[PDB]
């Protein structure tokens, strides 16, 4: 999920 | 070289902008901030205050050693509201640290750079040529150019989607 927020 | 600053009215509320508006990194909490239609509500993104219609313009960027950051330029029209893919079709030409590797964020597939450890990076925006270019200050080694037919105002873009890392504008 973290990288999905780029 | 351009003295750019961060636009706190564009910033994701989960971001933390430095006092002088040159730095950005992820916080662990949303903030009460007066949601504009211009603010990035979901993606961990902030533009610079100053955008460009025409010309060549340089900014420099101090990057972290740990994953989380992408940056480059976005066309003004880049969607702010909702979860948005991070890709050229969505108006975003960027470099990225992820899995301890530098990528030009292209699609359908991302392009891996075989550049060395990066500390500081010069961003050359040539609107009259139609290109954004990335150089390591460390010897002005060319990292990557995106050739782009920009048809509108183009803004400096920064995203930090993990704690433990950051981006700092120089100068």
Author numbering:
A (entry chain C): 2 to 7
B (entry chain A): 0 to 170
Paper text:
TRIM7 catalyzes the ubiquitination of multiple substrates with unrelated biological functions. Here we show that TRIM7′s extreme substrate promiscuity is due to a highly unusual binding mechanism, in which the PRYSPRY domain captures any ligand with a C-terminal helix that terminates in a hydrophobic residue followed by a glutamine. Many of the non-structural proteins found in RNA viruses contain C-terminal glutamines as a result of polyprotein cleavage by 3C protease. This viral processing strategy generates novel substrates for TRIM7 and explains its ability to inhibit Coxsackie virus and norovirus replication.
